Structures are given as structure tokens and as C-alpha cells.
Design a protein around this ligand. Structure first.
Ligand SMILES: C=CC[C@@H]1/C=C(\C)C[C@H](C)C[C@H](OC)[C@H]2O[C@@](O)(C(=O)C(=O)N3CCCC[C@H]3C(=O)O[C@H](/C(C)=C/[C@@H]3CC[C@@H](O)[C@H](OC)C3)[C@H](C)[C@@H](O)CC1=O)[C@H](C)C[C@@H]2OC
Ligand SMILES: *C(=O)CCCCCCCCCCCCC
Ligand SMILES: [Ca+2]
Ligand SMILES: [Ca+2]
Ligand SMILES: [Ca+2]
Ligand SMILES: [Ca+2]
Ligand SMILES: [Fe+3]
Ligand SMILES: [Zn+2]
Lengths: 169, 107, 352
């Protein structure tokens, strides 16, 4: 926020200076100076407009589920993407992009909503729905008609996508 | 690079500007000409908009060089496309891609 | 939007007591994107293969016949084809090959056509096309398809079945029906008969040519009169001339060469006619409308009866969507999800 209050405890890959640096970033970001951080404030700057995943990232970061990203969450969040970050915490993050209600399972509707978010009008909805159905029919190995982290990682686990989910701090 | 060879004319004057939404129909192929995707497959024209980095480089540099109604063959190089990483499931690493792009409209 | 049925058809559902497949039950299931039990699928493939294995390299087919061109995994257009050409229940059919690849419904095409062959072994004939092989199916999306929908066991079954597909057909003692065309090493019908069909088509030779040939891009107004020339398009086989076709025809006392292998915007093409008979020396029939969902072509079927060659045209029919190469939505969206997610942070951190 700028000033005092009692101790923030968190867990991360960051060293004393990386947290300071990130602390200054969170500072500029604070706008209303409330210490927390909301979507309106994230929406604040230039390249957070047609990034269809911005509200998704905010919600995954928002671990306490109160709509705003506080400093602890800001650190914990960016830490998933730090180098020194393990491939597993990165794929878990990925899983969370589709797993909207955070209950551990990507359902048909969520998969459709998250995809529609990025595809927009480049695919007809029947087309998108058809392929969502067929992906779940095939990856659903355990039977409940909804994709778990285990099944997600069975389809995705060998892709090197995570090697690029790395930011410098 | 991205080598453009025209297939159909179009008005040789109306080229797209940055910020302008290019409405196109494309059919992507590997260097051997073997098709890998097309907007015609979905009967949905791919709409992207110049400048805003919404497509691979070859497309930005290539589709800029096109006039409305023009149908041309963009022959994009890996570095201007997917490089050595390729694209999971469709594009093999270190691949040259030929795109038959048809500039339909601007909006 | 409709969902594909989870219930896989079992043996007793597909085959009746006489061991006759119920193509109607099969058609309906397949159209909803339904799958069979791998064992049933395998039985269809394997039982059709046994029938084909017994047929001759060069089939002897009597008119009336509906001759059909490339199908290319466009199962839903295969359904329209039958509406236009007639029920297999009372109409003699002859398919010129290329049942797989290109279209993402190749297995439903082989299954329905093989079952139909088991059901009408003497009125429905299937010929071999250049795509009914290993090198092309591994290259294109057929192998991947069999693995996504069934397994490589089914795939292998199809491969061995494809090796049983006849190479040509002598229709009504008049036409030489093949998928590609002529060959330098085939100057008579016996040359076809003396070929060993049961194998993967060779890198070159008579069997390769039959499956791969094309007429010259200038099948009439030529200056040279060269019979065969290498096919620079195909990267193999040849290009045959009007004098070449007219030489084969006169020599073997045939009317014309009916074939497919080449997309046509009208679903067919009549070539330069014989100066003796007012009939086209060559005919290309193409039965895949809106080819590759790209070409906006019509498809067609040849209907030969009572000395009349009538061409029936048909348009595309709707079909479900499959991402390129049967890729799943996760593998499809991930690279983009990574890119943007990383971009949000890069932008967010760059505020200092
Ligand atoms: C949620 C779904 C994902 C989301 C999908 C859609 C909006 C649907 C849309 C019609 C795409 C097609 O879906 C059927 C399909 O199109 C291809 O076949 C293709 O013809 C192609 O090359 N195109 C498409 C037309 C513009 C040019 C180019 C491109 O620039 O594409 C972009 C691209 C892939 C850039 C990568 C991204 C990762 C970077 O690392 C890499 O940087 C090197 C560059 C597309 C537009 C991305 O912005 C958006 C997505 O990916 C790709 C072979 C793979 C792609 O599917 C993924
Ligand atoms: C507002 O609510 C506080 C935001 C400012 C956070 C910056 C704190 C600096 C942390 C550096 C110490 C390193 C810890 C190991
Ligand atoms: Ca705030
Ligand atoms: Ca919070
Ligand atoms: Ca969920
Ligand atoms: Ca499951
Ligand atoms: Fe073909
Ligand atoms: Zn062919």
C-alpha cells in the first residue's frame, strides 16, 4: 500500500530484492492506495485490453476469493511464473484457467466459456460445442464427464507450453 | 520472409491500415502444399486487425501488402511464423507455411 | 447441439441371425457420430476384406451401374450420394477408390461401404484408389483418425483390407474403370490381370500407375503427341495423352476410360471425344462436393443404363466439426493461454 500495518506472511521463489521490486510494481498499481488491487485497477493500463485471460488471472491470483489481489496474492501469483518455478505449478495454473469455479474439475460449460473467451467469433458456437464435447468424451478416462487435473495432465503433460510461462522479476 | 504472389486482383488501391480489422478467408498449408487448416472449414471468416499483434508476423507483413478483394499466396518462413517450437498439434518445427489468403472486407 | 452417442453398437445389433449387417442401424448410428465395438468394427472390415480378396484384379461389371468418384472421408456427403444414385438395395454401384483421408470421417466411410459390400457382394463394387495404402494414410489424417476413434488394430485391419481392393473394372464390355488411369507397362487388359494386387502399391510400375495416373493438363490440343510423360504434379507415375488413351482404346476395343482421382468443380469432366465414336475418350467422375471444405465444387455420379450415360450432380451436406488433425481443445488453446497469461504479467511488471 505505501505504509504500515501488521506483517504479511507468504511463500515464494523470490529473494529479498525481487520482493522489493515487485513491491514497487504493486505500488504503482495500487491507484486508490487501498493496499489491495482490483480489476478496475488492472484494467487501468495499456496492454490489458484484448488479453481475454486478464479476469481469469485475477481470479486465480485472488486465492482468498474477495475480488481483489492483495500483495500476498500478488507475490504468490507471480511466483508461479518466476523462473525457479516448477513445471507442475505452471500446469496447475493452466488447469485453473479453465477450472472456473475452482472445484478441481473442468466441466463442459466452463471449457466452453473459457474457450469462447479467447476465440470469440472465429468459430461458430455449434462448432465450439462439438469439439468441446469430443475433447471431454476422449479425455474423460475416469468416467464423470468432467476433466480432472489428472486427465488434463494426461493430454497436456508432454507439451512444452510451460517453458514459456516465465517472467523476469 | 513472407513472399506474396497474387492469385486474384482486387482493387489495386485499398490496402489495410493499422487498427483496421481485416476480414479474411484463408487456407493454410505446409510447404508441400498439404493443407492443415482453413477458415472455410468453419464457414467463418477469420477477423483480425492490423498492428495489434494478433497474428504471426508473416500475416502482419503479408496481409498489409494486400488490396481488398485480392486473393494471394503468402509464403511465410518459420522465423516469421512458428519458428523451431512449431505449434502443438498442427505445425511441425522449423516449418515454412503457404497461406492462400483472400482479403474480403475491412471494418 | 447434439452429442455423440456413448453406446457402442455390439455384434447382435449390427449383425442379424443370417450374419447380414443391418446397414440401416449402422447408418443412423454413424451419422450421430456413434462408434461400434472395436470387435464389431473389425468384423466389418475383416469380413469385407475376405470378399474383396476373392474378387479379380479387373472386375467384370454389367450396366446398369452408378459409377462413383472420390469420397475422401466425407461420410455425410456419402449419405447424399446414395440418395441421388439410388438405394444399394436395388442399384448396382461401382466406387473408383479414395474413400479415406482429407475428410475427418474416413472410418465411417470404410465401415459403411464394407458392410454394404458384405450385404451386396455382387452388386456393390469397390476399387482401389491411391489413398488406400500405408504411406498416404500415415501422411494424411487416416492413421491418426483410427487411433482417436478406435485403435491401431482397426487401422492395421483396414490396411490389410485395402490390399484386397480390386485394381480395375471392365464395365459392360466397353469401359476401363480405374482410379488414376493408364500405364506404359499396361497395353492390354491381361496386363492388369497378371499383376499381384495384394501388397502396398510399389514406388513405380503398372499397379502404381493405375492408381496414380492423370491425363495431360492439355489432353487434346497438344503439339508433341508423347504417350506418357512423368507426372511432375504427383511426384510419381505419369501423365497420359489423348493419342495414348485413343491408342489403348482402339487396341483393346474399348469405348472410353472412366476414372476419378482429380477434383472437378462440376463433379465430372468429359474429355476430347473419339473421332470415330461421338463419345468422350476419357471421363473423370468426382463424388466429393465442397472438397476439403475449401473447393466449392459440386460432386457427381455416373449413371449408365440402356445405352445412356447420365450424370447426376449433388451439393455438399452438413457435417460435424473436428479441429485440424483431431487435436483436442486443450492442446489447441494452451499455447495461446500461455502467451496471453505471460503477456499480462510482462505488461503488469513493466510498470517500472
Ligand atoms: C483458444 C483457442 C486458441 C486461439 C484460436 C482462435 C482465435 C481460432 C483461430 C481461427 C486459429 C485456428 O484455430 C482453428 C488455428 O489457426 C492455424 O491453423 C492457422 O491457420 C494460423 O497459422 N493462423 C490463423 C489465422 C491468423 C494467422 C495464424 C495465427 O497467427 O494464429 C494465431 C496463433 C496460433 C498464434 C500463435 C500463438 C502462440 C505463440 O507462441 C505463437 O508465436 C510464434 C503464435 C491465433 C489467431 C491465436 O491468436 C489464437 C488462438 O490460438 C494455427 C496453426 C493454429 C490455430 O489454433 C491454435
Ligand atoms: C501495501 O499494502 C504494502 C505493499 C508494499 C509491499 C512492499 C514490501 C517490501 C518487501 C521487501 C522485504 C523482502 C521480504 C523477504
Ligand atoms: Ca487498490
Ligand atoms: Ca483477495
Ligand atoms: Ca469446475
Ligand atoms: Ca473424468
Ligand atoms: Fe483423391
Ligand atoms: Zn486419388
Amino acid at each position: 500500500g505505501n505504509e504500515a500495518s501488521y506483517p504479511l506472511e507468504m511463500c515464494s521463489h523470490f529473494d529479498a530484492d525481487e520482493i522489493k521490486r515487485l513491491g514497487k510494481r504493486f505500488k504503482k498499481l495500487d491507484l486508490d492506495n487501498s493496499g489491495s488491487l482490483s480489476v478496475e485497477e488492472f484494467m487501468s493500463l495499456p496492454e490489458l485490453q484484448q488479453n481475454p485471460l486478464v479476469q481469469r488471472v485475477i481470479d486465480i491470483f485472488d486465492t482468498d476469493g474477495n475480488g481483489e489481489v492483495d500483495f500476498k496474492e500478488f507475490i504468490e501469483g507471480v511466483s508461479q511464473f518466476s523462473v525457479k518455478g516448477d513445471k507442475e505449478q505452471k500446469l496447475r495454473f493452466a488447469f485453473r484457467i479453465y477450472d472456473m469455479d475452482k472445484d478441481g474439475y473442468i466441466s463442459n460449460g466452463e471449457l466452453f466459456q473459457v474457450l469462447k473467451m479467447m476465440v470469440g467469433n472465429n468459430l461458430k458456437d455449434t462448432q465450439l460445442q462439438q469439439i468441446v464435447d469430443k475433447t471431454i468424451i476422449n479425455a474423460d478416462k475416469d468416467g464423470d464427464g468432467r476433466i480432472s487435473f489428472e486427465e488434463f495432465c494426461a493430454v497436456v503433460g508432454g507439451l512444452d507450453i510451460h517453458k514459456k510461462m516465465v517472467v523476469d522479476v | 520472409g513472407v513472399q506474396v504472389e497474387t492469385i486474384s486482383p482486387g482493387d489495386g488501391r485499398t490496402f489495410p491500415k493499422a487498427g483496421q480489422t481485416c476480414v479474411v478467408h484463408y487456407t493454410g498449408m505446409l510447404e508441400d502444399g498439404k493443407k492443415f487448416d482453413s477458415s472455410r472449414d468453419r464457414n467463418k471468416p477469420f477477423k483480425f486487425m492490423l498492428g495489434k499483434q494478433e497474428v504471426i508476423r508473416g500475416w502482419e507483413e503479408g496481409v498489409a501488402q494486400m488490396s481488398v478483394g485480392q486473393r494471394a499466396k503468402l509464403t511465410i518462413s518459420p522465423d516469421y511464423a512458428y519458428g523451431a517450437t512449431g505449434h502443438p498439434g498442427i505445425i511441425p518445427p522449423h516449418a515454412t507455411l503457404v497461406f492462400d489468403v483472400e482479403l474480403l472486407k475491412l471494418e | 447441439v447434439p452429442f455423440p452417442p456413448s453406446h457402442r453398437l455390439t455384434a447382435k445389433e449390427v449383425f442379424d441371425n443370417d450374419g447380414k449387417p443391418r446397414v440401416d442401424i449402422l447408418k443412423a448410428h454413424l451419422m450421430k457420430e456413434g462408434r461400434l465395438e472395436e470387435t464389431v468394427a473389425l468384423r466389418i472390415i475383416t469380413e469385407g476384406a475376405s470378399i474383396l480378396r476373392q474378387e479379380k484384379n479387373l472386375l467384370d461389371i454389367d450396366a446398369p451401374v452408378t459409377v462413383c468418384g472420390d469420397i475422401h472421408g466425407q461420410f455425410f456427403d456419402l449419405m447424399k450420394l446414395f440418395e441421388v444414385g439410388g438405394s444399394p438395395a436395388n442399384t448396382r454401384y461401382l466406387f473408383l477408390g479414395d474413400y479415406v483421408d482429407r475428410g475427418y470421417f474416413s472410418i465411417e466411410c470404410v465401415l459403411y461401404l464394407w458392410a454394404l459390400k458384405i450385404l451386396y457382394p455382387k452388386t456393390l463394387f469397390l476399387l482401389r484408389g491411391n489413398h488406400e495404402c500405408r504411406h498416404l494414410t500415415e501422411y494424411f489424417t487416416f492413421k491418426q483418425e483410427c487411433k482417436i476413434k478406435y485403435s491401431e488394430r482397426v487401422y492395421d485391419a483396414c490396411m490389410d483390407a485395402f490390399d484386397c481392393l480390386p485394381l480395375a473394372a471392365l464395365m459392360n464390355q466397353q469401359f476401363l474403370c480405374v482410379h488414376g488411369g493408364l500405364s506404359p507397362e499396361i497395353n492390354t487388359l491381361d496386363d492388369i490381370r497378371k499383376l499381384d494386387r495384394f501388397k502396398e502399391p510399389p514406388a513405380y510400375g503398372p499397379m502404381c500407375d493405375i492408381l496414380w495416373s492423370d491425363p495431360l493438363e492439355d489432353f487434346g490440343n497438344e503439339k508433341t503427341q508423347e504417350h506418357f510423360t512423368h507426372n511432375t504434379v504427383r511426384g510419381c507415375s505419369y501423365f497420359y495423352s489423348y493419342p495414348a488413351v485413343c491408342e489403348f482404346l482402339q487396341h483393346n476395343n474399348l469405348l472410353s476410360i472412366l476414372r476419378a482421382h482429380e477434383a472437378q468443380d462440376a463433379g465430372y469432366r468429359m474429355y476430347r471425344k473419339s473421332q470415330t465414336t461421338g463419345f468422350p475418350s476419357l471421363i473423370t467422375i468426382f463424388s466429393a462436393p465442397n472438397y476439403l471444405d475449401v473447393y466449392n465444387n459440386k460432386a457427381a455420379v455416373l449413371k449408365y443404363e440402356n445405352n445412356v450415360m447420365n450424370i447426376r450432380q449433388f451439393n455438399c451436406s452438413p457435417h460435424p466439426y473436428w479441429l485440424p488433425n483431431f487435436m483436442d481443445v486443450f492442446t489447441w488453446s494452451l499455447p495461446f493461454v500461455g502467451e496471453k497469461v505471460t503477456e499480462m504479467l510482462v505488461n503488469v511488471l513493466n510498470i517500472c
